[PDB]
Design a binder for these strands. Structure first.
Ligand code: CL
Ligand code: ZN
Ligand code: ZN
Ligand code: ZN
Length: 116
DNA sequence: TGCTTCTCGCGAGAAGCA
DNA sequence: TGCTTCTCGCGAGAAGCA
């Protein structure tokens, strides 16, 4: 196998046999275990780097295009990810984006083709 | 440094199957 | 197909470099 189950109080966890990490969702555990097996590879279309998770590759690639999908709605400035946007708003606007705040807009990804 | 890269539950599309 | 199963984007707190 790649995991074993661990049931406490009827709550089911899925444990990675390699690093004993705990996962509520099995799909989560798979996504993780690929970093141990490298069974699937996610090569960047723009350079030679390869990634063990699809989302790593996607963040990387969007970084290649320079696209700025995250826009502060308080002053209009755009940012390439959640952390720059959040850091901006907290610091400049002394406000917290977390939750249904409507303090930022996430634009569709246009600089390359991903799910939407 | 307060500010890349990591983490994974959640659920919406995409792919697989019939 | 319409039904299910799978993929992975996303938030946002956390760990990690330097
Ligand atoms: Cl842009
Ligand atoms: Zn593991
Ligand atoms: Zn690349
Ligand atoms: Zn702003």
């Amino acid at each position: 196998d790649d995991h074993y189950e661990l049931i406490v109080d009827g709550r089911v966890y899925y444990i990675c046999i390699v690093c004993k990490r705990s996962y509520v969702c099995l799909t989560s555990l798979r996504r993780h275990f690929n970093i141990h097996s490298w069974e699937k590879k996610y090569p960047c279309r723009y350079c030679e780097k390869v990634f063990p998770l699809a989302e790593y590759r996607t963040k990387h690639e969007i970084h290649h295009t320079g696209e700025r999908r995250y826009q502060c709605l308080a002053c209009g400035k755009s940012f390439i990810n959640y952390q720059f946007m959040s850091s901006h708003i907290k610091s400049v606007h002394s406000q917290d984006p977390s939750g249904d705040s409507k303090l930022y807009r996430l634009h569709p990804c246009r600089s390359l083709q991903i799910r939407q």
